[PDB]
Amino acid sequence: NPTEEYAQLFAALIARTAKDIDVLIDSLPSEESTAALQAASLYKLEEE
Amino acid sequence: TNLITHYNLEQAYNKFCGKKVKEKLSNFLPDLPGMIDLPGSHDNSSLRSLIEKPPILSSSFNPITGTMLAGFRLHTGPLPEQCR
Amino acid sequence: AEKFDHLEEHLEKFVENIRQLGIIVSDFQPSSQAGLNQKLNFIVTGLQDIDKCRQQLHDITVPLEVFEYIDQGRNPQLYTKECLERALAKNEQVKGKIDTMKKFKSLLIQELSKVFPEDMAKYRSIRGEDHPP
Amino acid sequence: STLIEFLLHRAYSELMVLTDLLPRKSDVERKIEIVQFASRTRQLFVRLLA
User: Fold this and answer.
1) In a domain, C53, yes or no
2) What crossing angle do the helices spanning D27-49 and D2-21 adopt, rounded to 10°?
3) Which of A40, B19, B52, C76 is deepest in the core (most CB within 10 A)?
4) Cβ contact (<8 Å) for A18 and C107?
């Protein structure tokens, strides 16, 4: 009884973090790998 | 798989299951004559120690001279501090 | 088992020989004639017979811990029971651990199957490779 | 086989060692060595029997 509950909860925690892992990586704004585009945009409203 | 039956260990189980077994070696001493006191001290571990140095005894036998064994010619005298 | 017995009589033969020599020397009277040296001859000749007897049973191998029980006058038979309880209990350990970690395999793989729809077939392969095929 | 081999020779070797000391010992003392050696040697053989 305790072995199954503890094991099942541990497996459940994997799913909980898996959803958090996937949802958070998909929720990253500004999907880019170059700062040049950011710098041009970061310069635009600095001028503003 | 039952490893007891797979490796032919069932016969051992039927011979050495829960039964009356003396904690000492008193299952063979009574067959022998005389009063024998179980010598289970540390000094009795020689036979274990005897095996690490086989060379103490040469290949076949040590020198033997039956004629020199004349010291076993014993008089008829008493013996104190010794009980039969 | 014939050789096993054959060695045994010679071993007990020597034990009886020691007692007779010990009794003869202890109960020594002039009424004894040529009865002492003959007993010693049976001893020395008895010892030599054992050397020939240990070689036909050479295949027998005595474990180290077993002779330790003999040296201290312990219970070697109890060790056989101890080993019996040792194997039976620890057979549950290997299987118990296996079953403990097999159910974690079966259930967790089933959980992976219920979270990712696009990688469903792959999880079925994990269980297949998780068996000993 | 090796276990049996040593005890036979050591008892033989011990006996040979004693054979030298017995002739040059007191009348009452020579018997003590034989009785003690026989009893001690006998006990060593009981271990092999078991």
Assistant:
1) yes
2) 180
3) C76
4) no
Resolution (A): 4.5
Alpha-carbon span D26 to B76, nearest angstrom: 13
Contacts of range C22-26, beta carbons closer than 8 Å, 24 or more positions apart: C22/B34, C22/D35, C22/D38, C22/D39, C22/D42, C25/B74, C25/D31, C25/D34, C25/D35, C26/B84, C26/D35
Count of structural domains within chain C:
1
Residues 47-106 of C with CB under 8 A from D: 47, 50-51, 54-55, 57-58, 62, 67, 70-71, 76
What is the three-class DSSP state of A7? helix
> Is C1 among the domain residues?
no
User: What is the distance in angstroms between the Cα of C14 and the nearest Cα belonging to chain D?
Assistant: 9
Interface test with C, best of B8, B11, B13, B29 (most C CBs within 10 A): B13
Find all residues with CB under 8 Å of C60, minimum gap 6, and list them: none
